[PDB]
């Protein structure tokens, strides 16, 4: 969902 | 009752004025005597300061007077002429005419002349003279004018501010007892400083290093979940002839494989040897960012990077550069650009003895592959899905580092051609720089600029600090900077003039  | 003629009387000289020259001469009257009684033989009379000059009428009316003084018809600009004549009978009539001139006794002199130089006064007009015993007049802006030994005139010009709202046009009127003057009217010019080409001359060292196979260790990080460092394989960055830990990586994957960095060294491209004062490749540093969840990447990461150097007698230091990279695992959006995983590289270095001398290995940057000339920079942006590759840069200097080879001066002393000239105004700066031939007032003075092998600053004062930073394999032989420069005085004058610097290697 919310990766870097 | 006669009968009364008509008197004329001609233009006294031609212009029908008295001038300082016709002052000292004796002057013929004319005119004519023509109409009623008027016969020849009459007589002719008038009165010119005060004295009396008469002739008579001639045939066909005519009359003149032979000499007249100047001086009586310059302090006399009006005057009658009366004609007396007779009537058969014997009746008498005064035939009457009336003549002006004007009366201009001064002459000018005019002249173009340097300032802050004495002058000598040439042509000046005739009869131009000091009266009694003045030998010096002063002129309206408090220059002199001066009569010497040899008879000559001389000018003492002041120097003059040639740009602001008071003319430069200086005069003076001499006076003379017979009532002549002479306006003496001097346009000094401005003057200018000369500027002259200057030389220096700086030499970059060479000197070559023995140095042993480089092994590259991750040796510490700073958050990170999942965090591995390795010695390189195939699939994950590439083999090196070493054991040491080139590999690391971090995250739990998001999509498929672990963000990391992988350093692989430049073993077989040195051949065992580094040069001083040379942009050195130490290895190719890659950054594979892939998507790892949030929170799960490292913040900074240290690799040594050691080596050995060997001396003529044998004997091998070790030593180890130490590198810090700065890590910025950014949040993923639908803006690619923005979602880029940044890596930051710090200025490090270390320093290390060889026979009796230290050396300085310094951290440059990264740079492209396959680009030796490229760029070099310290922060790299790697999009996610995507590993971008960069040689890790250092340089090997003498010394502690402190600073890169450099030569200074002042290009107002004598650098082999003479020292600038600077003009009667004074107030002379340097007011602009630059690399090339082509100078004009600019807003470099006092800042670095670059030029084809290193940077210059050049002060106002004209002391400048040139410094080499192109590496010794790009300075070819009977390489040359030259910088332009322009220096202006107190009123806006300029000349420019060129810095050249030799820069050789040895
Ligand atoms: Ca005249
Ligand atoms: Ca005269
Ligand atoms: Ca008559
Ligand atoms: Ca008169
Ligand atoms: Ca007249
Ligand atoms: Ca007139
Ligand atoms: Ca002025
Ligand atoms: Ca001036
Ligand atoms: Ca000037
Ligand atoms: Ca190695
Ligand atoms: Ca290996
Ligand atoms: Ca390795
Ligand atoms: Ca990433
Ligand atoms: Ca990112
Ligand atoms: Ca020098
Ligand atoms: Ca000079």
């Given at each position: 969902?919310?990766?870097? | ?31 004519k ?9 009459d ?27 100047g001086?009586?018809?310059?302090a ?13 009978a ?29 002058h ?46 008071v003319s ?53 990080y ?6 591995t ?28 494989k672990?963000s ?20 050195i ?13 949030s ?33 910025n ?37 990264f ?17 996610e ?18 600073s ?11 650098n ?91």
């Open positions: 969902d919310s990766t870097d | 009752e006669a009968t009364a003629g008509t008197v004329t009387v001609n233009a006294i000289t031609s212009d029908d004025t008295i001038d300082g020259i016709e002052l000292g001469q004796t002057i013929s009257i004319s005119g005597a023509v109409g009623g009684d008027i016969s020849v033989g007589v002719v009379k008038m009165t010119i300061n005060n004295t009396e000059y008469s002739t008579t009428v001639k045939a066909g009316g005519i009359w003149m007077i032979a000499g007249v003084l001086s009586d018809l310059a006399d600009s009006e005057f009658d002429v009366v004609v007396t004549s007779s009537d058969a014997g009746n008498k009539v005064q035939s009457i005419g009336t003549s002006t001139h004007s009366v201009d006794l001064s002459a000018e002199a005019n002249f173009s002349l340097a300032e802050g130089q004495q000598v006064l040439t042509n000046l007009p005739e009869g131009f003279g000091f009266p009694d015993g003045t030998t010096e007049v002063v002129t309206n802006f408090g220059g002199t004018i001066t009569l010497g030994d040899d008879g000559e005139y001389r000018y003492d010009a002041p120097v003059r501010d040639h740009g602001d709202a430069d046009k200086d005069s003076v009127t001499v006076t003379l007892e017979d009532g002549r003057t002479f306006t003496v009217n001097l346009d000094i010019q401005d003057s200018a400083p000369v500027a002259v080409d200057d030389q220096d001359s700086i030499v970059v060292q060479h000197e070559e290093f023995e140095v042993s196979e480089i092994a590259a260790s991750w040796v510490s700073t958050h990170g979940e999942s965090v460092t390795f010695d390189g394989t195939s699939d994950l960055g590439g083999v090196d002839n070493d054991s040491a830990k080139d590999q690391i990586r971090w995250g739990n994957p998001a999509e498929s672990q990391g960095y992988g350093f692989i060294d430049n073993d077989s491209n040195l051949e065992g040897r580094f040069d001083l004062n040379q942009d490749s130490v290895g190719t540093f890659t950054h594979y960012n892939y998507p790892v969840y929170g799960g990447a490292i913040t900074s990461a240290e690799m040594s990077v050691e080596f050995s150097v060997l001396d003529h007698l044998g004997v091998s230091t070790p030593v180890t550069l130490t590198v810090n990279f700065d890590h695992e950014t949040p993923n959006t639908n803006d690619v650009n923005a979602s880029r995983d940044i890596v930051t590289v710090q200025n490090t270095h270390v320093t290390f003895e060889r026979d009796g001398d230290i050396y300085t290995v310094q951290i440059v940057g740079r492209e592959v396959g680009n030796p000339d490229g760029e070099v920079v310290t922060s790299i942006y790697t999009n899905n995507a590993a971008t590759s960069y040689e890790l840069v250092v340089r090997v200097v003498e010394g502690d580092g402190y890169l080879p450099s030569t200074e001066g002042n290009i107002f002393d004598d082999g051609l003479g020292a600038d000239s600077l003009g009667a105004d004074g107030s002379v700066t340097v007011v602009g720089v630059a690399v090339g031939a082509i100078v004009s007032s600019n807003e470099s003075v006092g800042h670095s600029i670059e030029g084809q092998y290193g940077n210059l600053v050049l002060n106002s004062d004209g002391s400048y600090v040139y410094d080499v930073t192109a590496s010794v394999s790009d300075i070819p032989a009977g390489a040359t900077e030259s910088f332009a420069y322009l220096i202006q005085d107190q009123d806006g004058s300029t000349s420019s003039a060129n810095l050249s610097i030799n820069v050789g290697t040895n």
